Amino acid sequence: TDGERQNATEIRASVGKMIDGIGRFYIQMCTELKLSDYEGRLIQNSLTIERMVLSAFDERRNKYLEEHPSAGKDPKKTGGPIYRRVDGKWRRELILYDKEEIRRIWRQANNGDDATAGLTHMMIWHSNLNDATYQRTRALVRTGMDPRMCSLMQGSTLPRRSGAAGAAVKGVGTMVMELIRMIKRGINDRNFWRGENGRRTRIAYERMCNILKGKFQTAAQRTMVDQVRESRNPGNAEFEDLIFLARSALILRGSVAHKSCLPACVYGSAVASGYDFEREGYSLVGIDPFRLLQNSQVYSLIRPNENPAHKSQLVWMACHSAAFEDLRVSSFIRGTKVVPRGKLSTRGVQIASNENMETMESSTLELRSRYWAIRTRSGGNTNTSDMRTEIIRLMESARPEDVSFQGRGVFELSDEKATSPIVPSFEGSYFFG
């Protein structure tokens, strides 16, 4: 590092203040919903609260709902399931809040500031949970992409309203999906790329293709994506080139940011415990999330005949965005063997409406890791016919044995300054296999 330490501390202060805003907003909403400590630590209650906040600030959807009211749902109220424990058993109740009220509470929590960064953080946490839980092979096959490249679908469920953080965290496969959807839309109707809407669509196409270009690593991919962007009315050839680019990302990996976006319950508990994230600072890639997870208790609803350990592992991988990570390193860091998706005896965290909340129980989630490591936004050792041939040569030269991140290991929770790394010595390796 260098004199950029001051810049590195201002960013820490800003992210700490956003975490403080999230936590104290959760505290205020828990007080306004009359939830006890146990219910306030429920992951489903936190998910519902977060979804209500995100729905309250959705400008486009709210405007459309206002202009086209839904069936029996007024466009000025939000809500979701609230799980409250009475006489030992759980019970769900649908709550309804005015969206102006939710926006006012959120603004008051952040000292009268909009703070869209906090909303983006909550959305990224939701996207990480969805990526760690569900496979969207249906959207892959519908768009023509191979369902085998599910490892490139990082941040696929993120809405467009996410800012630069959403673009940074979303993977190459999702960018290819968005571009291919635009290609198909232009193929269906030729009035696309033409007129006043043509300008806006071309601008959006330009911008998404530019940031996909910035996402790649090697020069050949970075030039083929530029060739794809240059075509004014792209057709099947550009779609095929994008397919090839996505396929090449499995070996020539692209740089995708990974951040530890925790559920709002953890931040609320930390703020209630007296932690000042504004003073101490925060970092989504450092020890700060791992340390916070170590000292926090979070409860979750367990469906009948389900394993709490599997659900805790799922929630942990969602928290650390380790859905597509190598299983060996995930198990090494966590200290408990991480079971692939096929052998997880658990369904999604969110509980459907058509469920009987009388055979359901709550289990404490073990969000503890034996070691901690720094999350990276980098790929690995990545060292129109001409570009395709060059890329094929590069992929053929690569092997699944080259060692990447040489000299970088895993640290202990006591090693806050990352002084002494532990290089692992190395079973299954794919989660979604």
């Binding site: 499995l250 070996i251 597509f324 720094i374 790929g379 699944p400 990447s404 979604f432």
Partner: peptide, 28 residues
């Protein structure tokens, strides 16, 4: 049967980044 074929390295840890080479290169 389809499934995950590559690995995306979220953690900065000395690794080998596995991928299923015969199936990926079979497409060309």
């Amino acid at each position: 049967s389809s499934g995950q074929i590559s690995i995306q390295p979220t953690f900065s840890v000395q690794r080998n980044l596995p991928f299923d080479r015969p199936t990926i290169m079979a497409a060309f």
